[PDB]
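Structure in, sequence out. Go:
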């Protein structure tokens, strides 16, 4: 009704009408800008305006500064948004980040257990509630888009991202797609499968990743080839993408991996033919980081081809993330030369705009300062603590069938020992994608280590001694009632985590042997995956697979001291040796140390 009315700016109008109205006004430069996502590290107000940039991200560890507050994050994001809103059309950018176990790049964010442990809970409603809390903590920092969930079905634990997979069993991964409506909100009653959805300003856009077969690569080699017939691809690796469509996942990220030698980032048949045309996905498809570069061998050796192949394959938004001028220049040339039709550009931009309008981003482009206090909120930590406890799998509770069960341990004892490299190391208990991509060691954020949790749990008369790596004599002479010893993997992600031997670093086993040799012991194993465990088992009275439980170490002691019983069950096969791999439930020659679904129980004290 005002004389300067512009339909796309009218919040009362249907999303599709707003999309069409804006699209019809855009120049080629404005269109290609929407398709471009850049790192905050290369962003400036002029770059964002002049190139009509559609999206920014923080990669792992890409932060305004170490220890930044929620408000500092909001101010940074809003500064970028102010630049984007100052363009001719005022299209807001969407800011993405890997919030994969909480808002994990941010100091003081609640850190939830990694996905493998969540699979052990068999509790999809718990995972939904984690999505809900994670959305609040992401919005606390002004960010609107999380690159989660990873719905890989990890079929070989030698993969460095196996901890990002809920299970080797697709049925468990499918169940855990409940993360999506946690992050985004529940879809309405009449909802069409494949449409994008986000409820509003207190929720975030989600991302089902990495499409498809990322968990199926040969020998678990990250980014490698997945060799499997269509029937197996569709039976193992694809199903959870359909659940994600049904729950309105807003975006899908493409895998670095290949399927039978075809790069996913160049696979028109799967990206356009299947995801878009068969599953009816109507959100946007985003590349992985320099994913189009890696289409070629060597990577980046023909970036012109990378742009052509990826955009023709059906990708909508490119996580460049640094060389935006080159990306934009090359894509512009391809359109100008008729190599890429305007129809393909218009489809990509239609999808990007659909997600942005749907989620309310044109109505609330800026951060809400009242949300900053959601970061690290005690209610969310209480949830993480529940999740950590439910994730724990009890593998042994007594050396013989006639021994007294060691767990639960008594809170009142004259003197107890807490030992091991992982007993008082917050970074190690969080693992990868915590503060940095690869994670880190020591007190990297706000949390409670296993040692701190023990001290918070025990009777006031119980003396707690910590020794990181005590010798056998120290233990034998110490007058201890029992010991809790924690060891395991160091933090990792992506290719750095690929590991053909799956043996934990020393000292780990040597400390368990020294401790358990002198006093009854409960071994807590911190890992992203099954690892060689027979020697640890042989030494230990009790052993718990605690995965990567996150910031809330009291989840571990909640079960050790019997406040709750152990309930977790293995979401993966535990192998006898790495020579067996790959080896999954349902295989012909299945000879596990512990089958998928195994877990001992205790009752609460």
């Amino acid at each position: 009704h005002a004389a300067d009315y512009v339909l796309y700016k009218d919040a009362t109008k249907p999303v599709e009408d707003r999309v069409a109205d804006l699209l019809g006004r855009m120049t080629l430069a404005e269109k290609i800008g929407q398709m471009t996502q850049i790192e905050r590290l290369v962003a400036t107000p002029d770059v964002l305006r002049d190139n009509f940039i559609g999206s920014l991200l923080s990669g792992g560890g890409s932060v305004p500064r170490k220890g930044a507050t929620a408000k500092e994050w909001q101010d940074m994001v809003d500064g970028f948004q102010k630049a984007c809103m100052s363009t001719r059309l005022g299209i807001p950018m969407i800011y993405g980040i890997d919030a994969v176990h909480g808002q994990n790049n941010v100091y003081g964010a609640t850190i939830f257990p990694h996905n493998v442990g969540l699979g052990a809970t068999r509790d999809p409603y718990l995972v939904k509630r984690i999505g809900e809390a994670t959305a609040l903590e992401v919005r606390a920092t002004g960010i609107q888009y999380a690159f989660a969930p990873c719905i890989a079905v990890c079929r070989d634990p030698r993969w460095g991202r196996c901890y990002e997979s809920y299970s080797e069993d697709r049925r468990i991964v499918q169940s855990m797609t409940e993360l999506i409506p946690g992050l985004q909100g529940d879809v309405p009653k009449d909802f069409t499968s494949g449409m994008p959805f986000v409820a509003g300003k207190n929720k975030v856009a989600a991302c089902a990743k990495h499409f498809v077969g990322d968990g199926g690569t040969v020998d678990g080699i990250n980014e490698n080839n997945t060799i499997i017939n269509r029937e197996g691809l569709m039976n193992i690796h694809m199903p959870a993408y359909k659940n994600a469509m049904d729950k309105g996942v807003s975006t899908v990220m493409i895998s670095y991996s290949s399927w039978n030698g075809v790069k996913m980032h160049a696979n028109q048949d799967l990206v356009t033919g299947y995801l878009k045309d068969t599953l009816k996905f109507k959100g946007f498809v985003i590349s992985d980081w320099e994913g189009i570069d890696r289409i070629t061998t060597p990577a980046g050796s023909d970036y012109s081809y990378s742009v052509k192949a990826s955009i023709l394959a059906g990708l909508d938004m490119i996580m460049v993330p640094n060389k935006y001028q080159q990306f934009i220049s090359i894509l512009t040339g391809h359109v100008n030369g008729g190599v890429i039709p305007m129809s393909r550009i218009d489809d990509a931009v239609t999808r990007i705009l659909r997600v942005k309008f749907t989620m309310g981003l044109f109505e609330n482009p800026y951060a809400d300062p009242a949300m900053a206090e959601q970061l690290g909120k005690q209610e969310h930590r209480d949830l993480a603590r529940e999740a950590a406890r439910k994730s724990l799998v009890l593998l042994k509770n007594g050396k013989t069938s006639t021994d007294a069960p060691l767990l639960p341990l008594p809170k009142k004892a004259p003197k107890i020992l807490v030992a091991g490299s992982h007993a008082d190391n917050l970074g190690y208990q969080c693992g990868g994608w915590t503060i940095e991509a690869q994670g880190d060691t020591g007190r990297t954020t706000v949390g409670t280590t296993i040692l701190e949790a023990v001290k918070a749990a025990v009777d006031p008369s119980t003396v707690v001694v910590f020794a990181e790596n005590p010798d056998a004599e120290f233990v034998k002479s110490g007058g201890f009632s029992y010991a809790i010893v924690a060891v395991g993997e160091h933090p990792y992600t992506e290719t750095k985590g690929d590991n053909l031997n799956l043996t934990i670093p020393e000292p780990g086993l040597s400390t368990v042997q020294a401790v358990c040799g002198g006093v009854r012991c409960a071994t807590v194993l911190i890992s992203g995956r099954p690892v060689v465990v027979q020697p640890l088992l042989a030494a230990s009275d009790a052993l718990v697979a605690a995965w990567l439980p996150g910031s809330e170490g009291q989840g571990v002691t909640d079960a050790l001291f019997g406040d709750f019983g152990f309930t977790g069950r293995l979401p993966r096969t535990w192998f006898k040796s790495v020579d067996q791999l790959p080896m999954n439930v349902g295989d012909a020659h299945y000879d596990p140390l512990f089958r998928l679904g195994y877990g001992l129980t205790t009752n609460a004290t």
